[PDB]
Design a protein around this ligand. Structure first.
Ligand SMILES: CCC(=O)N1CCC[C@@H](NS(C)(=O)=O)C1
Length: 185
């Protein structure tokens, strides 16, 4: 792909984070803490899952960023509407305002309803995410495998401003403590 020139500098929004997340001082890394991280509750925080949004809102144009997923066993990445549900249980689907992929139990899947199996020969250590607002496209790239395409959502109905979306995943196994990191430009 030749999307790298639409690179945007993403930072995480502490106020949206699940109360167990630890966001680095530079707002570029997030990991799940061992306990509640001593913050007040608010209506923005994801309650049920270890999720957080980027601070940036996109309503036009082309945007690209990269995320490091090294040594994680589970995670979700992509974009979502600014108006997505924060409290209770929900599925990641375009009907609920999410355009995402994930790793779970040694398989990669796109967050369609129902979910779509992905075909990845080289497990990625860094993921590129491209959004074309006007075209209604969200695409995912395998930076470890020379930028190969992972998945394209097309005919997207965003229906609002978009925010970068992250889920560090649970850590019941002891094998998923590693952070998500926003990679430098
Ligand atoms: C997402 C935060 C939360 O509700 N919890 C409670 C359930 C298990 C906890 N910890 S764990 C096993 O290390 O993932 C995290």
């Amino acid at each position: 792909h030749h999307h790298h020139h639409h690179m945007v500098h993403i930072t995480l929004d502490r106020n949206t984070a699940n109360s167990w997340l630890i966001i680095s001082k530079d707002r570029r890394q997030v990991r799940m803490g061992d306990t509640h991280q001593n913050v007040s509750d608010n209506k923005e925080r994801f309650s049920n899952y270890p999720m957080v949004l980027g601070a940036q809102r996109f309503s036009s144009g082309k945007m690209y960023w990269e995320v490091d997923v090294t040594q994680k066993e589970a995670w979700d990445l992509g974009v979502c509407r600014d108006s997505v549900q924060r409290k209770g249980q929900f599925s990641l689907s375009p009907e609920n305002g999410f355009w995402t992929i994930w790793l779970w139990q040694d398989s990669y899947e796109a967050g369609t309803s129902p979910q779509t199996t992905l075909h990845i020969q080289v497990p990625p250590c860094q993921i590129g995410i491209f959004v074309d607002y006007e075209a209604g496209v969200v695409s995912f790239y395998n930076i470890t495998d020379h930028g190969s395409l992972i998945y394209t959502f097309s005919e997207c109905v965003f229906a609002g401003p978009l925010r970068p979306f992250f889920n560090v995943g649970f850590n019941y196994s002891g094998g998923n403590a590693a952070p998500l990191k926003l990679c430098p430009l």
